[PDB]
Design a protein around this ligand. Structure first.
Ligand SMILES: O=C(CO)[C@H](O)[C@H](O)COP(=O)(O)O
Ligand SMILES: O=C(CO)[C@H](O)[C@H](O)COP(=O)(O)O
Ligand SMILES: [Zn+2]
Ligand SMILES: [Zn+2]
Ligand SMILES: [Zn+2]
Ligand SMILES: [Zn+2]
Ligand SMILES: [Zn+2]
Ligand SMILES: [Zn+2]
Ligand SMILES: [Zn+2]
Ligand SMILES: [Zn+2]
Ligand SMILES: [Zn+2]
Ligand SMILES: [Zn+2]
Lengths: 216, 217
């Protein structure tokens, strides 16, 4: 079972603290959501330290739909409303209109171009005109309150950044097996071991936030 | 001396032959690799007929391409599904005609596995589909092909729908951009090798344009 498998990454508190220190060091982490929800592991990177190599790993090891998790305030600053007026997706995944850097990219899809787009979007002094729409990067609006308001990878991403003391923007993508099926805990554990990436769950995060009275 | 692209593509035949082999591969359920103009994107996209799309084919795209797998549709089919342009004022470099993204309602879970994307695509491409069959947003990205195909707009979008129509297949195909492990986009020699290894013909939009000119006009 999951809890028993994750044991080798430490106890739940250790699992959170290792994830936070990985992010501070510029490394990625792998975040599992609830078993009865998606039961998927996403690679998470802090935008602050995002490299082309990190992006390239996501593209070749994950779904390739690399999303940029943003606070409401940052999404607002960039004038990125929800893609649809009435979201009826299974998880209410908060996709905004898709984006591309207006300047400094070609087709938008290379690892370099996605990073350029993401860095442009995450710039504290970005304006809406810095991004063309539509494009190949997929921003997501994180819920105010984070994982204590919504138990998604979107909130997990942003909460991790804030908990780590980093700028509150991260990227995510779902780890996918070569045959096209989604990675499960065993494969996720293996991937984290291969790539020196801490693994943790949303429940780890929730329990950690509760214990340490963490408003973010 | 490096030969030009046309010279590299010569082993696939002359322009017309390259299109004819593409059409036949699609009729046999195999994919093709379509290059656009060198002064446009200069990118090769894997293209598959939705009619014969399998989970294995989709898995290949996720593994070997950008993973942003797009569903090229006719304007008629997009309107049938009530899929408006994602943004009213499109200012992307090529005005790539993204609609709002989609997900099938039944038969899927999170929408992102190879099998889920296929289910979603099959659902959308069905000639008797209704808007309500598709949740929005989702993990499949439809594109509105321009009326007139590659003689009107020289995009992989139009190339896909033209290819299906010319092959006599359901006028819906899926595309995705071939990518190298280091995250750079695959270029002609890599596209050609990939095509040889996967038994997928390689062709260009210009080949398709010349074929339509010579075979229709
Ligand atoms: O679907 C997704 C984005 O395309 C993934 O599930 C991603 O992890 C964010 O969604 P959520 O916050 O609902 O997990
Ligand atoms: O960006 C893309 C995905 O949408 C690809 O270039 C795809 O080929 C569609 O674009 P176009 O028709 O402009 O080539
Ligand atoms: Zn493109
Ligand atoms: Zn998720
Ligand atoms: Zn002939
Ligand atoms: Zn002939
Ligand atoms: Zn003939
Ligand atoms: Zn999801
Ligand atoms: Zn294209
Ligand atoms: Zn070879
Ligand atoms: Zn291959
Ligand atoms: Zn014709």
């Amino acid at each position: 079972n999951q809890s028993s498998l994750l044991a080798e990454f430490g106890d739940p508190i250790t699992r959170v603290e290792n994830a936070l220190q990985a992010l501070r060091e510029g490394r990625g982490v792998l975040l599992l959501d609830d078993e009865d929800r998606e039961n998927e592991g996403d690679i998470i990177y802090a935008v602050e330290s995002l490299t082309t190599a990190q992006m390239a790993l996501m593209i070749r090891e994950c779904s390739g739909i690399v999303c940029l998790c943003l606070t409401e305030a940052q999404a607002d600053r960039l004038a990125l409303p929800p893609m649809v007026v009435n979201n009826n997706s299974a998880n209410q995944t908060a996709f905004t209109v898709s984006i591309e850097a207006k300047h400094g990219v070609t087709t938008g899809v290379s690892a370099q171009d996605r990073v350029t787009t993401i860095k442009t979007a995450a710039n504290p002094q970005a304006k809406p005109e810095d991004l063309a729409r539509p494009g190949h990067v997929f921003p997501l609006r994180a819920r105010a309150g984070g994982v204590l308001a919504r138990r998604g990878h979107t909130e997990g991403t942003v909460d991790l950044m804030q908990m780590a003391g980093l700028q509150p923007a991260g990227v995510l993508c779902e780890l996918t097996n070569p045959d096209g099926s989604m990675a499960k805990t065993p494969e996720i554990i293996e991937f984290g071991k291969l790539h020196n990436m801490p693994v943790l769950t949303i429940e780890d995060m929730v329990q950690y936030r509760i214990q340490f009275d963490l408003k973010l």
